[PDB]
Write a protein that binds this ligand. Sequence first.
Ligand SMILES: Nc1ncnc2c1ncn2[C@@H]1O[C@H](COP(=O)(O)OP(=O)(O)OP(=O)(O)O)[C@@H](O)[C@H]1O
Ligand SMILES: Nc1ncnc2c1ncn2[C@@H]1O[C@H](COP(=O)(O)OP(=O)(O)OP(=O)(O)O)[C@@H](O)[C@H]1O
Ligand code: NA
Ligand code: NA
Lengths: 232, 230
Amino acid sequence: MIKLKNVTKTYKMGEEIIYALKNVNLNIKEGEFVSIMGPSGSGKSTMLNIIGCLDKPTEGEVYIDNIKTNDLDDDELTKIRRDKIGFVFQQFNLIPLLTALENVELPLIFKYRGAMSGEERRKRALECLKMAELEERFANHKPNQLSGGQQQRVAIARALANNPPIILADQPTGALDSKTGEKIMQLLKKLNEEDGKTVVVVTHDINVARFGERIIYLKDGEVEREEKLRGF
Amino acid sequence: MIKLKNVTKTYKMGEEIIYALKNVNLNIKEGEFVSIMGPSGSGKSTMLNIIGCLDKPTEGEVYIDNIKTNDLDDDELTKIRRDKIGFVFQQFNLIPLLTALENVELPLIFKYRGAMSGEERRKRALECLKMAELEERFANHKPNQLSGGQQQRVAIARALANNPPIILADQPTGALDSKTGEKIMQLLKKLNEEDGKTVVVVTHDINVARFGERIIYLKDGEVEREEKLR
Ligand SMILES: Nc1ncnc2c1ncn2[C@@H]1O[C@H](COP(=O)(O)OP(=O)(O)OP(=O)(O)O)[C@@H](O)[C@H]1O
Ligand SMILES: Nc1ncnc2c1ncn2[C@@H]1O[C@H](COP(=O)(O)OP(=O)(O)OP(=O)(O)O)[C@@H](O)[C@H]1O
Ligand code: NA
Ligand code: NA
């Protein structure tokens, strides 16, 4: 479902060439729940961004659902992202002037081909907010009228909106108390197991990582090692 | 050192009233290390913002270093924040066009004690980035050229810059791996014990909270309970 083939991501800082990722190889099967851990700065978000078609590798190849994405243009990558990917940003990236509900309705409307009635919109968006454990009374608040954890739940609800087959979550529980985070992880488990969604979670929380069937550890831009939490 | 007296913070949403904090009472002594925990939305940041003079209570009173902040004008409040408090934001709030180093230096330029030379300012700023465990090689990166955890460390270094007596950290380890977070907590322990700094940390991580002398738990805008540790 997701394949990174000899992926390198570099940045040129002055006269020095920096490696965010260096020759990484990764294959994630359809319906797999994979966790990604590693030191601050090890390359986790760069990896998730590349998998999410939000960034292109400097070298190497990327395949999402068998399609080589690394040579597609801006327009084309957008269609793939919208159809196949639900992305939970670490920084949330909510639109300031839209309410929590409107923020969730965005990717629903961008993906959906026809004309969706306001009633199906509100309804579906609400389902997403409920799955993301955010109380209905907060649906009307703008991002700046919400707490960090409430904002994180809006970010999670938005990733679910387009019912994408792939869910990429960058530290989805970072701003949540352990009880709320646990419900979020149970949601991801349910979508993965019952719905066959491919789930990839970047996290600094071992308890969160343990919901995966594999934990990939990065170190200095490279896959240092892997952990199989299931037999093979 | 910090006192919240019957503090309420309300928001008017339409015709509805929302109590971010409702009649909270809090007394933090000088040199105390206190942790604040509670469910998402319980009122932790509102509390820290009020203590940090970044927001005013709707009702109740606030005292910092024995000074009542309630009716101080904006310049008086800016003055208190600058001398008394080092604030680590949850969202970081770094200036996009300034490098990591420049972001840390900014507070030094507007510290109304005396006047630091350009060399002294830079040197103090590097010391702060080092205490915050950020490698020297990242000092020239702008916020957008840094990872989430690297940005968090710049935010922490900036809070340390004016060597304030009070440090307010809003989930200071949220974007850090446990190893780096542990060093940050060891730094706060060091500044608290060796330097007598008053430290208040809001966190969702119990391991982080356990560095405090006590842990204050919020629930629905109210202090639910307190738990002494040592
Ligand atoms: N401008 C506002 N208008 C309305 N409600 C607000 C506003 N700012 C904050 N709130 C509300 O006050 C309470 C929240 O915030 P605080 O920001 O104090 O939460 P926290 O306790 O810090 O939680 P989190 O762990 O989710 O960051 C929330 O329930 C939130 O919805
Ligand atoms: N635009 C950029 N220019 C230069 N270096 C960059 C840029 N974006 C990211 N990096 C670097 O690539 C590596 C980082 O990021 P990533 O953002 O992939 O880290 P992470 O592994 O997700 O870490 P964190 O836990 O801190 O979030 C870091 O060392 C970082 O400084
Ligand atoms: Na990151
Ligand atoms: Na908060």
